[PDB]
Amino acid sequence: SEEKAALVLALFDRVEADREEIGAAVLRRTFEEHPETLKKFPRFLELYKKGSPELDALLKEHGKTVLDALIEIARLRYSGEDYRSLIKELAKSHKEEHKIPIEDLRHIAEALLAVLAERFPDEFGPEARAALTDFLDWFIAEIEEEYKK
Ligand code: HEM
């Protein structure tokens, strides 16, 4: 467990340094594999539909925002700090404001696993994959629990 905790933090350290490219790749992977998920993101849907040249920059911008939230929550959890405030307002905005089902959130987490296996093939081994999958399963269950309130 303590090994997995260190693997998660070290992995997110490397993701943080390349968050714009990785975040854009995660959003691209999610939207291509799940057009039903892209439909629930109106701004990205219209930029995709119209072949807008601004799409790449906005994918990098928002992809960094998504990864920054995951990185911060992981650092708070595995350091014994209070992450409840971030989990609640992230779940509030996505259930009430953005109206995003939990399954679409899983598509993002599944895309992050697939992107990291491609971007870090010699570091993202079985230990790193199992540790990140455990955190992502934990993150989804926490948001899902806040949904059921
Ligand atoms: C692990 C999954 C996800 C994470 C960590 C995440 C994180 C975030 C964060 C930190 C923000 C900015 C602050 C906020 O609005 O709360 C945001 C905004 C937003 N999210 Fe996500 N999100 C996830 C999944 C999704 C998915 C799958 C969709 C839609 C298909 C979505 C739709 C949106 C929208 C529409 C916004 C507003 C962006 C804007 O107004 O510029 N989220 N998300």
Residue numbers in the entry: 1 to 149
Question: What do the paper's sentences say?
Answer:
Here, we show that the deep neural network ProteinMPNN, together with evolutionary and structural information, provides a route to increasing protein expression, stability, and function. Myoglobin binds heme to carry oxygen in mammalian muscle tissue, and has relevance in clinical applications as a biomarker, as a versatile platform for biocatalytic applications,18−20 and in food science as an ingredient in artificial meat products. Current efforts to create more stable variants of myoglobin have focused on the stabilization of the globin fold through stapling with cysteine-reactive noncanonical amino acids. The globin superfamily, of which myoglobin is a member, has a fold made up of eight alpha helical regions, with diversity in the termini and two loop regions flanking the heme-binding pocket27−29.
To preserve the oxygen storage function, we fixed the identities of 17 positions located around the heme ligand in the heme-bound structure. We selected these less-conserved loop regions for backbone remodeling with RoseTTAFold joint inpainting. We generated two distinct sets of designs with structural remodeling: one with the region joining helices E and F redesigned and one additionally including the CD-loop region. From these remodeled backbones, we again performed sequence design with ProteinMPNN, with the heme-binding site kept fixed. One of the five designs, dnMb19, generated with the more aggressive backbone remodeling strategy, showed a much higher thermal stability of heme binding compared to native myoglobin. We found that it closely agreed with the design model (0.66 Å Cα RMSD), including the regions remodeled with inpainting. Native side chain contacts with the heme group are largely preserved in dnMb19 (inset I). Outside of the heme-binding site, the crystal structure confirms the structural changes introduced by inpainting: the C and E helices were elongated as designed and connected by a new loop (inset II); the loop connecting the E and F helices has a new conformation, and the F helix was straightened through the replacement of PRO88 with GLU89 (inset III). The Cα RMSD over the inpainted regions between the crystal structure and the design model is 0.88 Å, with the largest deviation being in the CD-loop region (1.51 Å). These results illustrate the power of RoseTTAFold joint inpainting and ProteinMPNN to accurately remodel native protein backbones while increasing solubility, thermostability, and functional stability.
